[PDB]
Enzyme design. Structure first.
Site, PDB file in Angstrom:
ATOM      1  N   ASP A 149     -18.754 100.214   0.918  1.00 56.85           N
ATOM      2  CA  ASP A 149     -18.002  98.940   0.984  1.00 56.85           C
ATOM      3  C   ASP A 149     -16.652  99.060   1.668  1.00 56.85           C
ATOM      4  O   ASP A 149     -15.841  98.113   1.615  1.00 56.85           O
ATOM      5  CB  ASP A 149     -17.896  98.265  -0.438  1.00 56.85           C
ATOM      6  CG  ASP A 149     -17.142  99.102  -1.422  1.00 56.85           C
ATOM      7  OD1 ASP A 149     -16.398 100.029  -0.964  1.00 56.85           O
ATOM      8  OD2 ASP A 149     -17.267  98.836  -2.639  1.00 56.85           O
ATOM      9  N   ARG A 200     -11.931  96.555   3.280  1.00 60.49           N
ATOM     10  CA  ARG A 200     -12.729  96.533   2.036  1.00 60.49           C
ATOM     11  C   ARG A 200     -13.528  95.236   2.045  1.00 60.49           C
ATOM     12  O   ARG A 200     -12.963  94.150   2.215  1.00 60.49           O
ATOM     13  CB  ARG A 200     -11.772  96.599   0.834  1.00 60.49           C
ATOM     14  CG  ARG A 200     -12.424  96.466  -0.542  1.00 60.49           C
ATOM     15  CD  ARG A 200     -13.420  97.613  -0.801  1.00 60.49           C
ATOM     16  NE  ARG A 200     -13.814  97.676  -2.224  1.00 60.49           N
ATOM     17  CZ  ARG A 200     -14.705  96.864  -2.804  1.00 60.49           C
ATOM     18  NH1 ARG A 200     -15.374  95.960  -2.073  1.00 60.49           N
ATOM     19  NH2 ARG A 200     -15.026  97.049  -4.100  1.00 60.49           N
ATOM     20  N   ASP A 238     -19.252  95.347  -4.721  1.00 58.07           N
ATOM     21  CA  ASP A 238     -18.854  96.682  -5.172  1.00 58.07           C
ATOM     22  C   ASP A 238     -20.053  97.564  -5.006  1.00 58.07           C
ATOM     23  O   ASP A 238     -21.062  97.343  -5.647  1.00 58.07           O
ATOM     24  CB  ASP A 238     -18.383  96.610  -6.642  1.00 58.07           C
ATOM     25  CG  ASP A 238     -17.728  97.921  -7.105  1.00 58.07           C
ATOM     26  OD1 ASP A 238     -17.150  98.604  -6.263  1.00 58.07           O
ATOM     27  OD2 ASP A 238     -17.753  98.175  -8.341  1.00 58.07           O
ATOM     28  N   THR A 239     -19.947  98.535  -4.117  1.00 58.22           N
ATOM     29  CA  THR A 239     -20.953  99.591  -3.999  1.00 58.22           C
ATOM     30  C   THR A 239     -20.570 100.732  -4.921  1.00 58.22           C
ATOM     31  O   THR A 239     -19.399 100.942  -5.178  1.00 58.22           O
ATOM     32  CB  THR A 239     -21.028 100.098  -2.550  1.00 58.22           C
ATOM     33  OG1 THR A 239     -19.730 100.392  -2.027  1.00 58.22           O
ATOM     34  CG2 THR A 239     -21.670  99.008  -1.604  1.00 58.22           C
ATOM     35  N   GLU A 269     -19.571 104.554  -5.837  1.00 58.06           N
ATOM     36  CA  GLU A 269     -18.842 105.590  -5.094  1.00 58.06           C
ATOM     37  C   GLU A 269     -19.856 106.554  -4.576  1.00 58.06           C
ATOM     38  O   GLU A 269     -20.925 106.643  -5.137  1.00 58.06           O
ATOM     39  CB  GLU A 269     -17.730 106.271  -5.933  1.00 58.06           C
ATOM     40  CG  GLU A 269     -16.660 105.308  -6.490  1.00 58.06           C
ATOM     41  CD  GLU A 269     -15.854 104.564  -5.425  1.00 58.06           C
ATOM     42  OE1 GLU A 269     -15.476 105.222  -4.445  1.00 58.06           O
ATOM     43  OE2 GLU A 269     -15.561 103.339  -5.561  1.00 58.06           O
ATOM     44  N   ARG A 285      -5.654  97.673   2.512  1.00 58.37           N
ATOM     45  CA  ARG A 285      -6.963  97.461   3.133  1.00 58.37           C
ATOM     46  C   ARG A 285      -7.122  95.988   3.492  1.00 58.37           C
ATOM     47  O   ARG A 285      -6.812  95.127   2.681  1.00 58.37           O
ATOM     48  CB  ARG A 285      -8.121  97.917   2.186  1.00 58.37           C
ATOM     49  CG  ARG A 285      -7.931  99.344   1.740  1.00 58.37           C
ATOM     50  CD  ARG A 285      -9.084  99.807   0.847  1.00 58.37           C
ATOM     51  NE  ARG A 285      -9.080  99.064  -0.411  1.00 58.37           N
ATOM     52  CZ  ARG A 285      -9.922  99.214  -1.396  1.00 58.37           C
ATOM     53  NH1 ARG A 285     -10.799 100.215  -1.390  1.00 58.37           N
ATOM     54  NH2 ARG A 285      -9.894  98.361  -2.435  1.00 58.37           N
TER      55      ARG A 285
HETATM   56  C1  LIG Z   1     -12.644  93.834  -3.291  1.00 58.84           C
HETATM   57  C2  LIG Z   1     -11.183  93.800  -3.796  1.00 58.84           C
HETATM   58  C3  LIG Z   1     -10.595  94.943  -4.391  1.00 58.84           C
HETATM   59  N1  LIG Z   1      -9.321  94.828  -4.802  1.00 58.84           N
HETATM   60  C4  LIG Z   1      -8.663  95.964  -5.571  1.00 58.84           C
HETATM   61  C5  LIG Z   1      -9.091  95.790  -7.063  1.00 58.84           C
HETATM   62  C6  LIG Z   1      -9.296  97.190  -7.602  1.00 58.84           C
HETATM   63  O1  LIG Z   1      -7.986  97.698  -7.984  1.00 58.84           O
HETATM   64  P1  LIG Z   1      -7.984  99.074  -8.825  1.00 58.84           P
HETATM   65  O2  LIG Z   1      -7.970 100.136  -7.701  1.00 58.84           O
HETATM   66  O3  LIG Z   1      -6.601  98.885  -9.423  1.00 58.84           O
HETATM   67  O4  LIG Z   1      -9.126  99.259  -9.675  1.00 58.84           O
HETATM   68  C7  LIG Z   1      -9.758  97.907  -6.314  1.00 58.84           C
HETATM   69  C8  LIG Z   1     -11.231  98.196  -6.245  1.00 58.84           C
HETATM   70  O5  LIG Z   1     -11.604  98.690  -4.903  1.00 58.84           O
HETATM   71  P2  LIG Z   1     -12.664  99.796  -4.885  1.00 58.84           P
HETATM   72  O6  LIG Z   1     -13.900  99.207  -5.498  1.00 58.84           O
HETATM   73  O7  LIG Z   1     -12.675 100.057  -3.396  1.00 58.84           O
HETATM   74  O8  LIG Z   1     -12.132 100.969  -5.743  1.00 58.84           O
HETATM   75  O9  LIG Z   1      -9.300  97.140  -5.243  1.00 58.84           O
HETATM   76  C9  LIG Z   1      -8.567  93.686  -4.538  1.00 58.84           C
HETATM   77  O10 LIG Z   1      -7.393  93.593  -4.946  1.00 58.84           O
HETATM   78  N2  LIG Z   1      -9.064  92.557  -3.924  1.00 58.84           N
HETATM   79  C10 LIG Z   1     -10.366  92.613  -3.557  1.00 58.84           C
HETATM   80  O11 LIG Z   1     -10.738  91.553  -3.029  1.00 58.84           O
HETATM   81 CA   LIG Z   2     -16.640 100.755  -4.699  1.00 62.50          CA
END
Ligand SMILES: Cc1cn([C@H]2C[C@H](OP(=O)(O)O)[C@@H](COP(=O)(O)O)O2)c(=O)[nH]c1=O
Ligand SMILES: [Ca+2]
Length: 129
Positions: A15, A29, A34-35, A37, A75
């Site tokens: 993702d 991103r 959510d994929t 890890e 991102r």
């Molecule tokens: C997809 C997405 C992730 N995020 C943030 C939330 C999560 O924060 P935390 O890192 O604090 O858990 C994280 C998850 O991304 P990943 O799934 O790439 O880890 O990215 C956003 O803020 N907006 C979004 O639209």
């Molecule tokens: Ca992920």
């Protein structure tokens, strides 16, 4: 919403992808998904699926939503398209991503992706097996 040009710089995982957007390198991103890890079940399969989809594409596009365009990690937040097919939706339809991180006002394609998830669930695909 509207699609804008980008070119692939490098696949990262299921993702996230590194694209050049307006001439600058950025990690994107994928919105609303959510994929797993890479180190988790179906993580490698997700990474492989997105890599194939973006590397094989003649044309990549990035579509921003109405809300924030960057997350707290810098991102880019977008829907990504490969030869006009949405990667976010395709990962969901294949059971390789869950609909997730649905924040208010960046959720234009939520119901489209939920319809794809329902069908991947019915077909008991991958994550849903
Ligand atoms: C997809 C997405 C992730 N995020 C943030 C939330 C999560 O924060 P935390 O890192 O604090 O858990 C994280 C998850 O991304 P990943 O799934 O790439 O880890 O990215 C956003 O803020 N907006 C979004 O639209
Ligand atoms: Ca992920």
């Amino acid at each position: 919403l509207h699609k804008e040009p980008a070119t692939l710089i490098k696949a990262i995982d299921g993702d996230t992808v590194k694209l050049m957007y307006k001439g600058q390198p950025m990690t994107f991103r994928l919105l609303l998904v959510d994929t797993p890890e890479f180190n988790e079940k179906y993580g490698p399969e997700a990474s492989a699926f997105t890599k194939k989809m973006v590397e094989n594409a003649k044309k990549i596009e990035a579509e921003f939503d109405k809300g924030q365009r960057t997350d707290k990690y810098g991102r880019g937040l977008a829907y990504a398209y490969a030869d006009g097919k949405m990667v976010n939706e395709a990962l969901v339809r294949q059971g390789l991503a869950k609909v997730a991180y649905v924040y208010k006002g960046n959720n234009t394609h939520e119901q489209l992706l939920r319809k794809a998830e329902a069908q991947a669930k019915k077909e008991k695909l991958n994550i849903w097996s």
